[PDB]
Design an enzyme around this catalytic site. Structure first.
Site, PDB file in Angstrom:
ATOM      1  N   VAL B  14       0.815  -1.210   0.000  1.00 50.26           N
ATOM      2  CA  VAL B  14       0.000   0.000   0.000  1.00 50.26           C
ATOM      3  C   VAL B  14       0.852   1.264   0.000  1.00 50.26           C
ATOM      4  CG1 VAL B  14      -1.940  -1.162   1.131  1.00 50.26           C
ATOM      5  CG2 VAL B  14      -0.250   0.005   2.527  1.00 50.26           C
ATOM      6  N   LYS B  38      13.047  -1.005  11.013  1.00 47.72           N
ATOM      7  CA  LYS B  38      12.318  -2.077  10.334  1.00 47.72           C
ATOM      8  C   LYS B  38      12.580  -3.393  11.067  1.00 47.72           C
ATOM      9  CE  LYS B  38      10.025  -4.155   6.794  1.00 47.72           C
ATOM     10  NZ  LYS B  38       8.727  -3.849   6.132  1.00 47.72           N
ATOM     11  N   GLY B 145     -12.684  -0.956  -1.621  1.00 45.85           N
ATOM     12  CA  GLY B 145     -12.433  -1.747  -0.435  1.00 45.85           C
ATOM     13  C   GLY B 145     -11.603  -1.052   0.625  1.00 45.85           C
ATOM     14  N   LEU B 147     -12.254   1.569   2.402  1.00 46.23           N
ATOM     15  CA  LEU B 147     -13.048   2.042   3.541  1.00 46.23           C
ATOM     16  C   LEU B 147     -13.215   0.946   4.587  1.00 46.23           C
ATOM     17  CD1 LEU B 147     -15.643   4.206   1.577  1.00 46.23           C
ATOM     18  CD2 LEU B 147     -13.572   4.902   2.794  1.00 46.23           C
ATOM     19  N   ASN B 148     -13.598  -0.254   4.142  1.00 44.48           N
ATOM     20  CA  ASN B 148     -13.694  -1.418   5.019  1.00 44.48           C
ATOM     21  C   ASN B 148     -12.361  -1.733   5.692  1.00 44.48           C
ATOM     22  OD1 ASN B 148     -14.898  -3.887   6.089  1.00 44.48           O
ATOM     23  ND2 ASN B 148     -13.599  -4.936   4.566  1.00 44.48           N
ATOM     24  N   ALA B 201       5.848   7.851  -6.961  1.00 51.38           N
ATOM     25  CA  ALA B 201       6.821   8.735  -6.334  1.00 51.38           C
ATOM     26  C   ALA B 201       8.184   8.079  -6.174  1.00 51.38           C
ATOM     27  CB  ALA B 201       6.314   9.209  -4.972  1.00 51.38           C
TER      28      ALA B 201
HETATM   29  N1  LIG Z   1       3.227   7.171  -3.743  1.00 51.35           N
HETATM   30  C1  LIG Z   1       3.839   5.922  -4.132  1.00 51.35           C
HETATM   31  C2  LIG Z   1       3.509   4.652  -3.386  1.00 51.35           C
HETATM   32  C3  LIG Z   1       4.151   3.365  -3.789  1.00 51.35           C
HETATM   33  N2  LIG Z   1       5.092   3.353  -4.913  1.00 51.35           N
HETATM   34  C4  LIG Z   1       5.700   2.069  -5.318  1.00 51.35           C
HETATM   35  O1  LIG Z   1       4.531   1.024  -5.205  1.00 51.35           O
HETATM   36  C5  LIG Z   1       5.189  -0.198  -4.521  1.00 51.35           C
HETATM   37  C6  LIG Z   1       4.539  -0.393  -3.102  1.00 51.35           C
HETATM   38  O2  LIG Z   1       4.904   0.641  -2.228  1.00 51.35           O
HETATM   39  P1  LIG Z   1       5.585   0.126  -0.828  1.00 51.35           P
HETATM   40  O3  LIG Z   1       6.743  -0.813  -1.054  1.00 51.35           O
HETATM   41  O4  LIG Z   1       5.991   1.302   0.023  1.00 51.35           O
HETATM   42  O5  LIG Z   1       4.315  -0.668  -0.120  1.00 51.35           O
HETATM   43  P2  LIG Z   1       4.403  -1.463   1.316  1.00 51.35           P
HETATM   44  O6  LIG Z   1       4.454  -2.931   0.984  1.00 51.35           O
HETATM   45  O7  LIG Z   1       5.606  -1.012   2.082  1.00 51.35           O
HETATM   46  O8  LIG Z   1       3.153  -1.134   2.103  1.00 51.35           O
HETATM   47  C7  LIG Z   1       6.442   0.060  -4.471  1.00 51.35           C
HETATM   48  O9  LIG Z   1       7.080  -0.340  -5.698  1.00 51.35           O
HETATM   49  C8  LIG Z   1       6.600   1.703  -4.511  1.00 51.35           C
HETATM   50  O10 LIG Z   1       7.930   1.961  -5.047  1.00 51.35           O
HETATM   51  C9  LIG Z   1       5.411   4.617  -5.667  1.00 51.35           C
HETATM   52  O11 LIG Z   1       6.161   4.596  -6.559  1.00 51.35           O
HETATM   53  N3  LIG Z   1       4.771   5.890  -5.251  1.00 51.35           N
HETATM   54 MG   LIG Z   2       7.364  -2.085   2.817  1.00 51.93          MG
END
Ligand SMILES: Nc1ccn([C@@H]2O[C@H](COP(=O)(O)OP(=O)(O)O)[C@@H](O)[C@H]2O)c(=O)n1
Ligand SMILES: [Mg+2]
Ligand SMILES: Nc1ccn([C@@H]2O[C@H](COP(=O)(O)OP(=O)(O)O)[C@@H](O)[C@H]2O)c(=O)n1
Lengths: 226, 227
Positions: B14, B38, B145, B147-148, B201
């Site tokens: 996410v 982490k 989904g 919101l849930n 981003a």
């Molecule tokens: N605003 C954003 C959010 C995610 N992403 C990319 O979408 C993928 C999922 O983001 P993430 O690794 O932070 O997700 P988590 O598994 O940490 O919740 C990753 O490849 C991010 O580099 C992005 O480019 N720009």
């Molecule tokens: Mg992550």
């Protein structure tokens, strides 16, 4: 009274509708009378209709519903898009209580997940389950993230004393993969896995779907629901 | 101490990691000292490394890890595969407490969702937030989904008195469709939406990422996270 189960899912597109039909079909072949209620249906513009799936796949005829909105959104958004309101809480609770009868299995399918708004104002499938004193069958994936979503749904159920009637994996992949196999074992450690329906079962014709469904659940458990 | 924030999500993928990087970046630009922690990292054999990615995106150097497992699975399954054990609950807390400092924003990035098991038996990030008295920043999608999932996560936090520091929409599409714009308006009625990070981003260079991060958050809110 008979047995009322809300069939909820951990998210969208986890297979709730195929599970309702499959348990409906398994109960029908156990000599149990089945009724399914989908109070709010969305996405009618593109042809969504979960009750007609249950009718085709499982042959239920008692198929009850209150509202249908064109847009493929969550109920509250689809209603605001159409310029109309969700149905009232009393409508859905009373529709379900009126479906309920001795010897009958009544399944209530929600829209998406346990806590999406189903009726005005802000009443959910959980509220509805509380009101009709229903237990909940929870439809999960076998994919990454399912353990978290399952635990979250299960905690939300228990917070309002909605008993958990078990889990069903809506779609079981072929071949599984390391994640699905691991998750299935891990899912069974937090609740009874009642069935795992093979991927693609919703394309089956009615006879093949009945065969799959009869094999997919435990005979004693289905018969024991009513 | 300073301020400890756990950063959790309604699911995997996410945008937790990008959010951590963006909030770290905005706080750094406010002169706030930042640490990103982490405690459990999976998928290292696929190259998954959120600490390293927070460093690439926002320049953070105070980066602390504890358990790492090769396979891209839930921590409990990744550890079983590798024949290793999950860390104990107190090992995670120690990792965070070693970092905590007055004037410092310490961010604790979960693994997947809020109820993923991080320690035995069934110890989760919710438990850890209780132990270090951290609030939780909840990263959500804008898709069907959300919101849930957001409401389920928020209930789970309230059940253990873990304060919700707000919501962040992890990936925000440009342009937003109808469902995304509806979800966004509805999420703001559920809890404060602290930011909605522009989609993709992770391809911004150090400067464009930092600029994006300063604009994405309210300066008062960021500056108010630690005194
Ligand atoms: N605003 C954003 C959010 C995610 N992403 C990319 O979408 C993928 C999922 O983001 P993430 O690794 O932070 O997700 P988590 O598994 O940490 O919740 C990753 O490849 C991010 O580099 C992005 O480019 N720009
Ligand atoms: Mg992550
Ligand atoms: N075992 C299964 C489960 C779902 N499906 C299909 O995958 C999609 C999601 O299932 P569904 O409509 O029951 O999902 P819900 O939104 O009702 O939870 C549907 O198009 C099903 O037809 C399948 O083919 N085989």
């Amino acid at each position: 009274g008979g047995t009322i189960l809300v069939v909820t899912g951990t998210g969208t597109g986890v297979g709730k509708t195929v599970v309702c039909a499959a348990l409906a079909s398994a109960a029908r072949q156990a000599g149990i009378d089945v009724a399914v209620c989908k109070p709010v249906q969305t996405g009618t513009a593109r042809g969504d209709d979960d009750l007609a799936e249950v009718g085709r796949l499982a042959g239920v005829t008692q198929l009850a519903g209150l509202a249908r909105y064109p847009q493929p959104m969550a109920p509250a958004a689809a209603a605001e898009h159409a310029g109309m309101a969700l149905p009232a809480r009393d409508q859905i609770v009373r529709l379900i209580a009126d479906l309920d009868r001795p010897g009958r299995l009544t399944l209530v399918e929600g829209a998406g997940g346990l806590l999406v708004e189903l009726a005005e104002p802000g009443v959910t499938l959980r509220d509805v389950a509380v009101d009709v004193a229903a237990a909940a069958l929870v439809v999960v994936t076998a994919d990454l993230g399912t353990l978290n979503h399952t635990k979250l749904t299960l905690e939300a159920l228990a917070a309002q004393q909605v008993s958990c009637a078990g889990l069903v994996i809506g779609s079981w992949p072929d071949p599984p993969g390391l994640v699905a196999a691991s998750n299935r074992s891990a899912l069974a450690r937090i609740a009874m896995v009642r069935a795992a329906l093979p991927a693609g079962a919703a394309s089956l014709d009615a006879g093949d779907f009945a065969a799959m469904s009869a094999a997919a659940f435990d005979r004693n458990w289905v018969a024991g629901l009513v």
